[PDB]
Amino acid sequence: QISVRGLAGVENVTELKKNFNRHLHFTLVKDRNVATPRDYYFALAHTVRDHLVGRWIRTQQHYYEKDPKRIYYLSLEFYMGRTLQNTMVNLALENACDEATYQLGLDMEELEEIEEDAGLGNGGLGRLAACFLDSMATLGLAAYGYGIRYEFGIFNQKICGGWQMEEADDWLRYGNPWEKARPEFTLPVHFYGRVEHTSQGAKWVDTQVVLAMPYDTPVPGYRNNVVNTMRLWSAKAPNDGYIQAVLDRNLAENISRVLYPNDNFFEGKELRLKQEYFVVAATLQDIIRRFKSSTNFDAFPDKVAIQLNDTHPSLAIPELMRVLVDLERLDWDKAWEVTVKTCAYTNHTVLPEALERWPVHLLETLLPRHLQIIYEINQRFLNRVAAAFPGDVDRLRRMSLVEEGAVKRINMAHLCIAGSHAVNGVARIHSEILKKTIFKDFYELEPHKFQNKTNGITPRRWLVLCNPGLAEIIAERIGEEYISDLDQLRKLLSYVDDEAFIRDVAKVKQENKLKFAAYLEREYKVHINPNSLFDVQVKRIHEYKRQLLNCLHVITLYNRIKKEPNKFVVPRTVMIGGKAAPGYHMAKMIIKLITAIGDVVNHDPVVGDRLRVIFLENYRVSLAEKVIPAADLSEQISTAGTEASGTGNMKFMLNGALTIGTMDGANVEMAEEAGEENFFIFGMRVEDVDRLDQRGYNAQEYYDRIPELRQIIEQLSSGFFSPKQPDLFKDIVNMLMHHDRFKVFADYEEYVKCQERVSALYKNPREWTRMVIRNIATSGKFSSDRTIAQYAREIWGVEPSRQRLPA
Amino acid sequence: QISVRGLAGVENVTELKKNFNRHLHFTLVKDRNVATPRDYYFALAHTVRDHLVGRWIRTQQHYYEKDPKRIYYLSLEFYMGRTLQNTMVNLALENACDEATYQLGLDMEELEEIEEDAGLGNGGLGRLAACFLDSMATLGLAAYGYGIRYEFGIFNQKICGGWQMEEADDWLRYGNPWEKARPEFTLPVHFYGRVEHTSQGAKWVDTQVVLAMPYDTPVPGYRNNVVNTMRLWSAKAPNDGYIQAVLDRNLAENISRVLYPNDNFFEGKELRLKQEYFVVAATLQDIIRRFKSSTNFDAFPDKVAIQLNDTHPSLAIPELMRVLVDLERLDWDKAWEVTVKTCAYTNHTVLPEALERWPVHLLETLLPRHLQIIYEINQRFLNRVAAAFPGDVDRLRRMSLVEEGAVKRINMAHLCIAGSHAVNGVARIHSEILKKTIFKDFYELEPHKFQNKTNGITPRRWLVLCNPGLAEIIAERIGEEYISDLDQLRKLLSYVDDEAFIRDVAKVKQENKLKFAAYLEREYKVHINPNSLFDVQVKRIHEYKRQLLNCLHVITLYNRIKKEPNKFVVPRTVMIGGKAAPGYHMAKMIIKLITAIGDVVNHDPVVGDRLRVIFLENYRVSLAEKVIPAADLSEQISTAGTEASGTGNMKFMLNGALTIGTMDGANVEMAEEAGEENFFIFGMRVEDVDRLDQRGYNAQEYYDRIPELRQIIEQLSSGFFSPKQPDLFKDIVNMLMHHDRFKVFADYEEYVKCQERVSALYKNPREWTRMVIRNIATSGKFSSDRTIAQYAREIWGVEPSRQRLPA
Ligand SMILES: CC(C)c1ccc(/C=C/C(=O)N[C@@H]2O[C@H](CO)[C@@H](O)[C@H](O)[C@H]2O)cc1
């Protein structure tokens, strides 16, 4: 149908059809009369997967012959989503399969909806890992993603009475056709035990063994026949009264059972630490095994790069030391040199309560040898600090890996900076904040380590896959090359005054909204006006992201309509979606608030279809792929200085929404690229927030000067939104007035006024769409291909490559 | 090479080769340069499995069209062993695959050795279930095996210091290519809760739900293109603080985790009861679903037969009642009629401590509604007893389902007799003992229910598969038809005086022994004389099977050699193998005794290679397939009246060993079929054992009159076989002298004298082999095909059929 989806040749369609029917028969053990749509999905999945394996096998063969430097991306989170459509897109099979399935009397889009999300992540950090794998494959780097194969990913969110309920994400129930188990590459991981000292050095003994079993998942590059690997570890008990012994195997295997759903607040849970060492221990043995079969570890940094996705795999540093010192018998100073040259650390975390600070007593019991190595690293590091800043005893305690207090803690961020040759933030403003405030001491010691690598998203998933309409009309003007070189989108600037393009861009948006409005009714029984402005905020629920600020605006719009019912206002559908961490009470209250507002606003006949407030249930990658193309307004309204980068922001920009947001994270670079006039900026900058802290933030002040705000607080306090439970939202009002770290009231006025200007622009469709084109045309910088190319050149020391491997 | 293995056509060999290479590439994701032998096995396995599915699909289709009566075989144990060779044999693919693998430069026999045993059973009862499935498929019956998919089958036995160590049988580690998961046929099973009474009857409420997920395994008939199903259930938790909730899913899923390894002694363990209801509950919903889609349950017994393999699935009876009464609203008397007409019960158990007697308090908590139904069944049953035997109050308490005492118990055997239209023993003598003693009262009430169905073994696995040499030389004389009609073996009688046949039969035995003697050295580092008599006892270790009696003979032979070193004796290799239940102390001592005897006898230079005592480690189906063809002497020496039937006895007879044994179980029928002169019978009959009990068994009497026996006991007591621990075997001597339920000393003299006559016959090879031919020629009755044909005609009311389905 559309040209970016590839050719549908007679030969290929014929071949896909018999391979489909073969798998239905031999692999699924069904015939057409008993097969369900799930069976049809699996047959299609197995058919598409057959096209990968040849490429997968010769890609790994290729890396053995040529022996290039290998990139290892260590993360506890890989938020992959669905794999079927992505694989088809990257192999140029999308039309052929659509034609093939159509000729068997099936709708492919219906079969794609049956595939479970691989939700092995929480949000931004996990999804960045997925975009990176796609981009690394596309740029021909010999790159492996390493992580944990959780049996249960992020929980499925269900709303019940406006409250979030969590149920288990049993994503492997029906099987995963994409993974290949490799039980033959199983490796021991050690826990507990104690340290024995001998003449021939230290020895870790009396350990409990857990087995790490790898599962390989293919990662296809975009039309280059490169297929990289993602290797995920699964926990297995070794095989050495009787009944209970066998049942107790579960304790060892619990290590890979479930993803920790907490992305706001650090908790020193033993099981979480086991997960972190597990991934690190098995991965490093795998790395070394591959290096040895290419004794001279001088070359190790020329053949290996290890990227740490935050501090979650920080133990890679002392583990590498342990192996090099205890098992390989290198002297300390030489092992340390190899380690620093090998490792690099990316920070994603601003807020102090999110930083990993492990209690020493935990490391003592579980990883006694790693504690010793950490103490030794700290001592040699602080000696360098003393020598460079003699007398500065304050600097010593601040820079120490060991934090003293009631309970001693290891600061894993300090460990990472010390043992890595490079540390980077994920947006320019974030990288500056790291140098100016939280790692200032470390920056003064080793200024050369600190870099910036502004985040990006993959245009394959986040344009071609989720928005074929938009991808096609762009292709008609400028061709196909933009898909792996997103800077080419700039050529769309010369079409900003083209009447036909303006009409087509606006039509694609209108189609996407119509399709999404129908998804809402069929799957969730809610009706919305498709001619309203689609105002969307989707992301994990945290106070710093300020979903509450959105709520305040929503209530303001409602109150103005009730005050002057017969005045014209731009109709809006306001959609808010996202998961709250299970133990985060305030986040759970905010979700309840949003549904409570919906209960009042959506059933007021004076309002009509001029305002709707919908909470998007179970926000996840596959939902983002649907709602993002349908959005008009992207809400990126975090308190300045709190959102390290953001990545959702970039998804919306690439898909034809305008952004209302603060000068935070990548927003700054987004406005810079598009021009500030094509961006709805508002609120305090970083410097303003700092000025407010010195004086002291008094919320009452804003309550006293702003009557519209006073009315909203009084409605919340007195039960306007909770008639049966008048004091339901007392914690929210109380936090907003006395304990608001994120200064919601301080931005309220500028926010509400900026929102009026959005509505004004939306009243003139032509000028809205022209501003949209200017955003889409300048979104090129935010491709993960650019990001990875900078990591490659400036951190890993490998050159990218767009060239095809033989098919 | 040999003709019974089928044709190796050019077309077929070519086809198997490309399908092999296809699976290696697409399914395993390997190439020839990295593939291990395990990868090669899996490719072969997947190739052979492709030939099954077409037949599997049209077999199930066939049963839907024609709608024949369905046989459901419920067992907690299916001892299947390996599937690859069996499937090849039954599909006539054995030579073709051998030729195909040879042309790819692989040895098929080496690949067969990589397949894990499916050890989902303990011994006789579990293996009988497997033989029955094979025979049911071969006779064209619409038959389904239903059971539990244990993650861990019977433990792998390792000897360490002569002591048994158990380690977990992780048979699914590498995957099972034979099973097809059917997550779409998942069913709820209920536990706990309570009973509510209403106007519309009883209701079971507040239950915990566990999900039962079926896995289907194909069961191919012998060259008839019938492929039946074995459906095994797996436990799954439903999907409805957070971390722990997810980890606690393991508790529900523990139901299908491990096979209870205890086959001697009943233990009222809750988890075991859950296993029993789990299999019964999910299976009966599946049966009913299939019946309803063929409201009139009058026809239920004309379309369904449920066979209970011992009392382990006894709860099928009250569960069927529950469904019929509570959910379908049939009146009690009509539901009861359908239940009795549907169910049938096979007893495998003589010893009282092996009978299931569940504590009432357990049933109360776990299955409250089933307790009520059982009480009601008991009351209506005892009313019939009272009415037929008025005044006999003793009969009432004896026949009751409820046993009174300190703790009340339900007697599941009494439940089964009451709710089944047929009860059978597994050998004629066993079936008579059930009528004369343990179920005498029940026999007097309902004489028509009690039948005999003498056991059998499948000649496919137990001759053609494990003994191709012997199968071939038989085929040369009489043709191929004997393989599915074993009575034809009688035609070998006219070759008892044939010189060439005698030479060939004796040569096959000698080849089998040479092959097995080499297996011992390569895999276990033990050398043996292949010209010795191969004296073999393999079976689970129990006092009633009297491995100790064997030990006493072994020590006697040793002592006679030490006494007159230069006299000639027939050389023997004595092999004893089998597992002991983990908590069975005496069984563990006996294994230690056997290795202790080996430590003395195998390292005495005066003995030479005239006597060897080897303990066969990890006895299991695939080991039985190797050792049985190599045996000369089969030891079946249970105290008369204790071994219900035995089935190993039949395996040895079919494979050219002579039997030394008591008149117990199927031995009686084996001697009858071959003639008593062609059988080494010895010891007390059932009547003699009973005479001894009345007088009282005094072991000291035998110790006083038999000097050779006194010497053996004194050697045991004083530490002759345990120099470092002089009193190691005190429990054994003490049991033998004061607490021997099984009267080992009482048969010693006849046993030792009978063993001398065996040695005498073995000195004349020609006459040994002629006696062997007379055994093999009369082993036809002991085919499971005959057994199943009798179950079919006399219990299930279906006619067998040897006719082929279309290929
Ligand atoms: C509790 C602790 C172990 C923890 C676990 C997960 C997280 C997750 C952090 C995360 O997702 N950070 C986001 O990373 C994105 C990619 O760099 C950024 O766009 C986003 O601004 C940042 O919040 C944080 C702390």
Ligand SMILES: CC(C)c1ccc(/C=C/C(=O)N[C@@H]2O[C@H](CO)[C@@H](O)[C@H](O)[C@H]2O)cc1
């Ligand atoms: C502990 C209780 C639940 C229990 C569990 C398993 C068993 C196993 C019994 C068994 O294997 N019996 C054997 O059945 C064979 C086939 O009928 C007979 O040949 C054999 O003589 C009999 O012991 C017994 C009791």
